[PDB]
Every structure is written in structure tokens, then in C-alpha cells.
Design a binder for this molecule. Structure first.
Ligand SMILES: Cc1cc2nc3c(=O)[nH]c(=O)nc-3n(C[C@H](O)[C@H](O)[C@H](O)COP(=O)(O)O)c2cc1C
Ligand code: SF4
Ligand code: SF4
Ligand code: SF4
Ligand code: SF4
Ligand code: FES
Ligand code: FES
Lengths: 90, 227, 156, 442
């Protein structure tokens, strides 16, 4: 779940400056007026867009060493392939 | 018991202790990894380096390991010596050469001794441009998770699991920079005290799976002293 | 399921009688089983441990530390070439290239027939006679890229 | 020089070598004054007297460092309660460029057996272990046959020479690691443990093999003992006039006309060994540099060829005597690729105990490989130099790395131009992230 209370938000961009994944981004939009304050509480359904946003081509998972579907151990950037301790090479 | 001189200031410490233990107990901050208050001193990571002078007139001392050096009376040491600071930062840099970029997705973030020492040594710039070593992980049962990529080879786990808890299923395998710490084969750690590894390991190789399911950072936890 | 042969068991036991702690026989115990199997099968680690009364993790650590102890299958005749500096000046690189061509493999792997395994080794203590190589337990000195094809034939 | 006549007094360690290069066995060994020094010591001199004689002789270690064997034997505990003691022979010889031990063990096995027998009596040791590398197949069979022959003759076993001294000798074969050569690592390897070095103090003298008083000595060091207890201390002191008393198996290798090793007194200049014995560089090759004694020694130039082969002379020159087995580098050899080979060895022979040696040496190998491939970037030589200073004595847990940076620092010192040709690319460890303007450090 991801919840942002825009009733308290001051739009400072400290959170966007803090991501190591360029996921959270403040976009050029200013029209968010509401009738009930409870509707100023946005969830992931009201936050997750369908594109990369201001940062066009950055994938933290291509830099991380943690294996995921698609990237196995040794398949990240600047990463060597796992060498078994039972290898015969000295 | 003994009088030592750290960075000019004089301190009264127990001569039976090592300079690391003594200075840490004085409130002085020296980076460390391989040493543990309960597992003793081994002198592996070479991180607790301090410059030691023979007397008060010595201006060209030597870099020694505070954990492997007695807090003897008449000891002149400097933690702020430039060479000591440079060497201590270099040790962290060498450990960062093959360290994975997985802070955001590791369960030790905000509770990691390695993160604390990197910052304490003031190492924020990378010069290494070559490849980082990788290791495949193992299944260690339903309580402890394995992520060998985040290892720094301090040997704390094997010294606690085997020399303190007397376990027989954890070990160090391989040689040189391909040293691996885990079980001889995939399976559940059999020690009834295997959980202490999560706090013993200074990195995120051993983590708590019971928490990983609903993981939250240390700063977001409400804690209370309980029995 | 790996099972130590009676001969191997007796060999390890004899070694244990030459030292105070039975653990001191671990290195040789790994070499005995290897001499009879070509390498140390994964099952051997536990079996050797039961004979020496030491944690299997300890036996595995020794095996994965010492290079000559093989924890991965190897060919019938292992070929070890000196890659040290004296032999580097003498020209081991040519010998390595010759071996790679005649065998169509690279350092660290076995041939399809499973007859040879090309592994680099450190100094072999014979630089005055380099380049140097060891096939099986036989040492070969004054190596020349032209003699490689013939030398390998001897190890049918 | 070309035809060296070997008289027992001038060549105490090689005068018995046969021309057929076959192993001299008990009968032949005793014919050439064999086990006489043992007889004199076991039945005549007290254990303490033997120690004093070796100390007076000035027998220094021939395994690398020149520590007094007698002093080392004298630092042994004086507690009678500590009855169980051990003597360990460092037969392991994996330092690239060294082959002296093979000659003695494979051709003169009884010489080592006798040296250990006398040395054990002095150290009051009941068991002795020859830590031999596995690659030495012949030495193993030869030493084992020698021990069997000696036991039959009653030189090893119980009540040796009717003295009541009981000594059992065992040959331990190794499994490939070079670190096992380090004294404390040898003890750990002997106990069937990963050959990770130990820390001193405590020193192996009080608590070594299985926590028992232990003494580690090189094959050559032990093979020098028999002659001292047979020909006398005075003879050994007058063998030469150098501060380093005694003879040493010295030699030269590396594209020289006659590569090999020769028993020579300390003081023989490297020039003599290179020209009189090695026969000079092979026709068509010019001398560029030379390592005094091992892959872990600092490179010296032609100007240092007139320096005597002693521990102090080479040290002042800026290197170490080491094993005294020198290696010659010709002009056709690139220093960067040579040091890359040295580092690749030193880096993979690391045991992985301390960060400086485990993660620092691998970095250097990558920089050297980049330099030899023309992919060097500015700052590479500085990192190499910083590594050499931060992997120096005291910083690492043992002396594997301190000696691994000795060749590197020297090559950069005398042949920097070769390391500079490598840097051909601009420095860059960061790619360009779109959307983020980079901090342009100037
Ligand atoms: C990395 C390393 C490798 C060594 N290898 C050997 C070796 O192969 N043979 C040897 O005799 N000493 C070797 N040594 C030195 C031993 O630790 C020790 O000094 C020697 O066995 C005793 O010397 P001595 O008895 O001749 O005085 C090595 C030392 C280091 C640091
Ligand atoms: S940090 Fe982000 S969520 Fe918090 S007030 Fe600033 S812009 Fe809003
Ligand atoms: S172990 Fe510490 S430094 Fe390493 S990725 Fe995890 S949190 Fe970051
Ligand atoms: S797993 Fe943890 S305790 Fe063990 S060597 Fe690695 S960092 Fe140290
Ligand atoms: S210097 Fe350190 S890492 Fe290298 S062999 Fe010695 S103890 Fe091991
Ligand atoms: S904490 Fe002192 S050497 Fe590691
Ligand atoms: S370098 Fe090849 S035998 Fe020494």
C-alpha cells in the first residue's frame, strides 16, 4: 500500500530527492482541489502512472545485486558471474 | 589500572583490556567489524587501525590494530592521525569494491554496522571502476535468510556459531576473495541459538525471515523494554 | 550414496595414528578418496568427517581452501602448467596455447572424452628447467609448443 | 666457475651430490662422513650445548628471513613440565623462482634426516614433521625411503644410538596453497585446518602445534646443522668472511645461458653468479632488471649487480636477499605484464583473512590488466602506489601482502614509463543518468 495525505503535503520534493529508484516524483500539476479532506488521501491507485515520468531510463533493479525474475546473480551492471568455491581453477 | 594517552588526552583504563575495548568504553569512536565484546579479538578486517608511538617524543609511530593491542600503561596512540584515518577509510573502500548496490532492498538498512562505518570513515566517493564479485545464496531454514553478496569477510558468524555456540553446520569455504560463509549444503541451521547471527553479522547476509514478511525500517518501529 | 572403501578407511585411520588430533589427517583423507575417485565426491566430505570426528563443514572448508583437493569432477589425466613469472619469461603462454588447441578446451575445463583437464598451477620448483608442466604425477621440463601434441599422446 | 671442484669444507651441502644425479642412500651417505655429527651430538654434547654451538656458528634462516637458528632454538620454553615439543621442517617451497629445497631432498634425503635428528635432540622434540608440497612426488618417496633406512640402522625410532632419545619422523604432503609456507599457517595446515596464518604473540615457541612448544625451520637451514656438528663451529665461521656465516645455495634463472643453483658463500656479488655461473644473458637478450631472491622481493637494476649477496647489502640496496635464488629480466620483457603475473599469483594465494590483502591485491591485478591492455585511466598508478604503502608491513595480518607489493613498488620506481604508456583513456566510473544533471567536479 502507498498512502500520501496531500492535505498535509507541502510539495517540497524532499521525498523525490530521497528515492534511490526514481519512483516517487513531483510532477508539473497544481489542480488538486477537493470537497472532502478524506479524498485528499491518495492511494497507489491514484499515484501509480503508466510511464517512467521525468526520469526516462533508470532501473535500480539493473544496479542492485539482489536476484529477481529477469536478472540473476551476475547479470547486474559492473557485476561478475558467481564463481563456485568448488571450482577447479586456482 | 593503566594510564594511556589517546590524542594527547590522558585516560585511566584496565591494562587487561585491548585499546579498542578501552577507547570504546571511554566514549572514543574507532571503526571496527571483526571484533565482538563476547567473541574476543582476531585482527582480520584491520579496520580498528590506530597510530601508536613508543614514547611522548616519538613523532613517527606505526599503524597497529587497537583490538589486538594491549591497553598497557604508558601507551601513546592517536585515532585522529591522518595516516590512521586514511588507512581506516581505505579498508572500507576495499570492502565497498565488491559490495552490492542493494541498500534500498536489504533488511539491514538503517540498522547496518557497515553503513555506519562507511559514513564514520567519511567514504562517500567511489574510484573503483572494475567488476564486483557475486555469490549465489543458500536456503538456511524458515528463520534466517542468506545474501552472501553483502558479505565483508569479518568471520564473526563462524566465530560465534562455532567457537561460542558450538554449532557444526556453519563454516567458511573457498579462498582469497571467493571466501563463502554458510552451510556445507542447503538446509535449516540446527543451532538453537542460530538467530543471534542476525545481530552478530555486521551486514545483511544473515537476516530475520519472520520480519522480512512484514518488514519495516528501525526508525518506524515502536519499541518497549519487555521480558 | 557415497561409501568409503575399507582400503580408504584403513588408509585414513593409519594417517590418524601419526598425529595427536585426528583432525590433522583431514588433508590426506581428502587426497586418499581423491586418488581412488579422481576427485572428492560431495558424499565423501561427510564420510571423511565421521571417520575423523570433525564437523563436515570443517572438512568442506579444508577441501574448498586447498586447490589440489578437487570438489568438481576432473578428467582421467589432469594437466597442470606453471603460470608463474620465471616460466612466464620462458614462455608458458605458448605451451598453454598449444595445449588449448590440441585439446579444444580452455584452462579450467575437461575434454569431451574426459581424458584431460587443463588447470594452471603456481611455481613447480624447477624454473632452471622451464617452461614446466605436470601431467598426472609426472613432471615435464624444457617444454616447447611443438612437443605438446606428442607428450599428450603418451597419456592414452 | 664452469668446472667447480667441490671439497667437503668448501661445499658442505653439495660435495656429496652424485654426477648421475641419483639419490645418495644411507650406505653411500655414511661413507661420506654421514651421521657422524649426529653421533657426536647425541652421544657427547648436551641439548643446550648443541643450541649454543649453532648460535656461535651463526647459522641464519635460509627460508627467507635471516633469523638466527640458534636464537630461535634458544627462545624455546625452559619449563620441564612442557615435555611434549615438536620440530617442523618447512619443505613447502612455492615462492615463484625457488627450487633449492627440491635438489637437497630429492638427491640427499639423509642430510635433512640427520639435521632434524640433531636439531630435535637440541630442542628436546619427540616427533618431527616434514611439511612437503604435494607437487614434490620424488622428494616424498626419497625422504620416506631415507627414514625407513635410518630407522633400520637405528638412527630414528627409540633409544637412538643407545642414548634413550626417542624421535619419530613423519612426512606430511600438502595440497596446493602457497600460504602454507608461512610458519603459523604451516602449523594450522599440519593440524588439518585452513592454512590461515596465526598472530604473535604468543609465538609458536610456547604455544604452536596443538598448543605445544614448536620450532619451524627451512630444509636448507636444517641441512646446514649436520656439517656444523661434524666439522666444528670454527670451520663454519671461517667458511667465508661475510657477516652472514656459512654457505648458501644461490643461483640465477630467466633466459640466462646456464640457469641453475650453486653452493656459494655469502658475499659473492650477483654479477659473479650471473656471468661466471649463469653464463650471462642468452645471445640476443640484454639485462634490464633482476629480483634478488623470489617473486616477493623488490626488483633491482644492473647497477645493483656489484652488491654482495648478503642480507644487509641487498636490504640497503632497497630489496631483500630472500632465497638468494635470483631471476634475470631481459629487455624483451614488459615490466607491467611481468608484475601483473606476480600480482595474479599473490592475489589468488591470499587466504582471505584480512581486507588489505584479500580485497586490495585483486584491485591491483585489475589496474595492471587494464594498463597492459591500453585501457588505463588517470589515477591508476597513484592507486597502485597507495596500495603498496597501505599493504606494507604492519598493516596486513601476515607478510604475504607486504612482500606482494615489493615487486610492484620497485617496477613503478625504476620503470614508471612502462606503467604510464598504459593510461590511454579518460577516467570514468559513472554513466550518464538522463534527467539528473551531473555534479561537474573540476
Ligand atoms: C607468504 C609466505 C610464504 C612463505 N613460504 C615459505 C616457504 O615456502 N618456505 C619456507 O621455508 N619459508 C617460507 N616462508 C617463511 C616462513 O614463515 C618462515 O620464516 C620459515 O619457514 C622459517 O625460516 P628459517 O627457519 O629458515 O629461519 C613464507 C613466509 C610467508 C609470509
Ligand atoms: S517530502 Fe514529499 S510528501 Fe512530504 S511534504 Fe514534501 S513533497 Fe509532500
Ligand atoms: S548490508 Fe548494509 S551496506 Fe550492504 S546493502 Fe545491506 S544495508 Fe546496504
Ligand atoms: S556473513 Fe556476516 S559475520 Fe559472516 S563474514 Fe560475512 S559479514 Fe562477517
Ligand atoms: S596477508 Fe592477510 S589475507 Fe594475505 S595471506 Fe596473510 S593473513 Fe591471509
Ligand atoms: S576490529 Fe580490529 S582488526 Fe577487525
Ligand atoms: S616458475 Fe615454473 S617452476 Fe618456478
Amino acid at each position: 500500500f502507498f498512502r500520501i495525505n496531500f492535505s498535509r503535503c507541502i510539495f517540497c520534493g524532499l521525498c523525490e530527492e530521497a528515492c534511490p529508484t526514481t519512483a516517487i516524483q513531483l510532477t508539473p500539476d497544481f489542480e488538486m482541489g477537493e470537497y472532502k479532506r478524506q479524498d485528499l488521501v491518495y492511494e497507489k491507485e491514484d499515484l501509480l502512472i503508466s510511464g517512467p515520468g521525468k526520469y526516462p531510463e533508470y532501473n535500480f533493479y539493473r544496479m542492485a545485486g539482489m536476484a529477481i525474475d529477469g536478472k540473476d546473480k551476475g547479470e547486474a551492471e559492473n557485476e561478475a558471474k558467481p564463481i563456485d568455491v568448488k571450482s577447479l581453477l586456482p | 589500572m593503566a594510564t594511556i594517552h589517546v590524542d594527547g588526552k590522558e585516560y585511566e583504563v584496565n591494562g587487561a583490556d585491548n585499546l579498542l575495548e578501552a577507547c570504546l568504553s571511554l566514549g572514543l569512536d574507532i571503526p571496527y567489524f571483526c571484533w565482538h565484546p563476547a567473541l574476543g579479538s582476531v585482527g582480520a578486517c584491520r579496520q580498528c587501525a590506530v597510530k601508536q608511538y613508543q614514547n611522548a617524543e616519538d613523532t613517527r609511530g606505526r599503524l597497529v590494530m587497537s583490538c589486538m593491542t594491549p591497553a598497557s600503561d604508558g601507551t601513546f596512540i592517536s585515532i585522529d592521525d591522518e595516516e590512521a584515518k586514511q588507512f581506516r577509510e581505505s579498508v572500507v573502500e576495499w570492502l565497498m569494491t565488491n559490495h552490492p548496490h542493494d541498500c534500498p532492498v536489504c533488511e539491514e538498512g538503517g540498522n547496518c554496522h557497515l553503513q555506519d562505518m562507511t559514513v564514520m570513515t567519511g567514504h562517500s566517493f567511489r574510484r573503483y571502476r572494475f567488476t564486483k564479485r557475486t555469490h549465489r545464496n543458500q536456503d538456511l531454514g524458515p528463520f534466517i535468510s542468506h545474501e552472501m553478496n553483502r558479505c565483508i569477510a569479518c568471520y564473526r558468524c563462524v566465530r560465534y556459531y562455532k567457537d561460542y555456540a558450538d554449532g557444526t553446520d556453519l563454516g567458511v569455504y573457498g579462498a582469497h576473495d571467493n571466501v563463502y560463509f554458510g552451510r556445507p549444503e542447503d538446509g535449516t541451521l540446527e543451532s538453537e541459538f542460530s538467530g543471534n547471527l542476525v545481530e552478530i553479522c555486521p551486514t545483511g547476509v544473515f537476516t530475520d525471515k519472520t520480519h522480512s514478511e512484514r518488514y519495516n525500517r528501525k526508525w518506524d518501529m515502536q519499541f518497549a523494554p519487555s521480558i | 550414496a557415497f561409501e568409503l572403501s575399507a582400503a580408504e578407511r584403513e588408509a585414513i585411520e593409519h594417517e590418524m595414528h601419526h598425529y595427536e588430533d585426528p583432525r590433522a589427517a583431514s588433508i590426506e583423507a581428502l587426497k586418499i578418496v581423491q586418488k581412488q575417485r579422481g576427485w572428492v565426491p560431495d558424499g565423501a566430505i561427510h564420510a571423511i568427517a565421521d571417520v575423523l570426528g570433525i564437523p563436515a563443514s570443517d572438512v568442506e572448508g579444508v577441501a574448498t581452501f586447498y586447490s589440489q583437493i578437487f570438489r568438481q569432477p576432473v578428467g582421467r589425466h589432469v594437466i597442470r602448467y606453471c603460470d608463474s613469472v620465471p616460466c612466464h619469461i620462458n614462455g608458458y603462454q605458448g605451451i598453454q596455447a598449444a595445449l588449448e588447441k590440441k585439446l579444444n578446451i580452455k584452462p579450467g575445463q575437461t575434454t569431451f572424452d574426459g581424458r584431460f583437464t587443463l588447470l594452471p598451477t603456481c611455481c613447480l620448483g624447477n624454473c632452471d628447467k622451464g617452461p614446466m608442466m605436470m601431467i598426472d604425477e609426472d613432471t615435464h621440463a624444457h617444454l616447447t609448443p611443438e612437443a605438446i601434441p606428442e607428450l599428450l599422446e603418451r597419456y592414452k | 666457475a664452469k668446472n667447480i671442484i667441490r671439497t667437503p669444507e668448501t661445499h658442505p651441502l653439495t660435495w656429496r651430490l652424485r654426477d648421475d644425479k641419483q639419490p645418495v642412500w644411507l650406505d653411500e651417505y655414511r661413507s661420506k662422513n654421514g651421521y657422524e655429527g649426529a653421533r657426536k651430538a647425541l652421544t657427547g654434547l648436551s641439548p643446550d650445548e648443541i643450541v649454543n654451538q649453532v648460535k656461535d656458528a651463526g647459522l641464519k634462516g635460509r627460508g627467507g628471513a635471516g633469523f638466527s637458528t640458534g636464537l630461535k632454538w634458544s627462545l624455546m620454553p625452559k619449563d620441564e613440565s612442557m615435555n611434549i615439543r615438536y620440530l617442523l621442517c618447512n619443505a613447502d617451497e612455492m615462492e615463484p623462482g625457488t627450487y633449492k629445497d627440491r635438489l637437497l631432498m630429492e638427491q640427499l634425503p639423509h642430510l635433512l634426516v640427520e639435521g632434524m635428528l640433531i636439531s630435535a635432540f637440541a630442542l628436546k622434540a619427540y616427533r618431527g614433521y616434514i611439511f612437503l608440497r604435494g607437487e614434490y612426488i620424488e622428494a616424498a618417496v626419497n625422504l620416506r625411503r631415507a627414514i625407513a633406512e635410518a630407522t633400520e640402522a637405528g638412527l630414528l625410532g627409540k633409544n637412538i644410538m643407545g642414548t634413550g632419545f626417542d624421535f619419530e619422523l613423519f612426512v606430511h604432503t600438502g595440497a596446493g596453497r602457497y600460504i602454507c609456507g608461512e610458519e603459523t599457517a604451516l602449523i594450522n595446515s599440519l593440524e588439518g585446518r585452513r592454512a590461515n596464518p596465526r598472530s604473535k604473540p604468543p609465538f609458536p615457541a610456547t604455544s604452536g602445534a596443538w598448543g605445544k612448544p614448536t620450532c619451524v625451520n627451512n630444509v636448507e637451514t636444517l641441512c646446514n646443522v649436520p656439517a656444523i656438528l661434524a666439522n666444528g663451529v670454527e670451520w663454519y665461521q671461517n667458511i667465508s668472511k661475510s657477516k652472514d656465516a656459512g654457505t648458501k645455495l644461490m643461483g640465477f634463472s630467466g633466459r640466462v645461458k646456464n640457469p641453475g643453483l650453486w653452493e656459494l658463500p655469502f658475499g659473492t656479488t650477483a654479477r659473479e653468479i650471473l656471468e661466471d655461473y649463469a653464463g650471462g644473458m642468452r645471445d640476443g637478450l640484454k639485462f634490464k632488471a633482476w629480483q634478488p631472491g623470489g617473486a616477493g622481493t623488490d626488483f633491482l637494476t644492473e647497477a645493483h649487480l656489484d652488491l654482495p649477496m648478503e642480507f644487509e647489502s641487498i636490504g640497503k640496496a632497497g630489496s631483500r636477499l630472500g632465497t638468494a635464488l635470483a631471476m634475470a629480466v631481459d629487455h624483451e620483457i614488459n615490466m607491467v605484464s611481468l608484475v601483473r603475473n606476480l600480482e595474479e599469483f599473490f592475489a589468488r594465494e591470499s587466504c582471505g583473512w584480512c581486507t588489505p590483502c584479500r580485497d586490495g591485491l585483486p584491485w591491483s591485478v585489475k589496474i595492471l590488466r587494464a594498463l597492459e591492455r591500453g585501457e588505463g585511466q588517470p589515477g591508476d598508478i597513484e592507486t597502485l602506489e597507495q596500495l603498496c604503502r597501505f599493504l606494507g608491513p604492519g598493516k596486513t595480518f601476515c607478510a604475504h601482502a607486504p612482500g606482494a607489493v615489493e615487486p610492484l613498488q620497485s617496477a613503478i620506481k625504476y620503470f614508471r614509463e612502462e606503467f604510464e604508456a598504459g593510461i590511454k583513456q579518460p577516467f570514468s566510473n559513472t554513466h550518464l543518468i538522463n534527467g539528473i544533471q551531473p555534479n561537474l567536479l573540476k
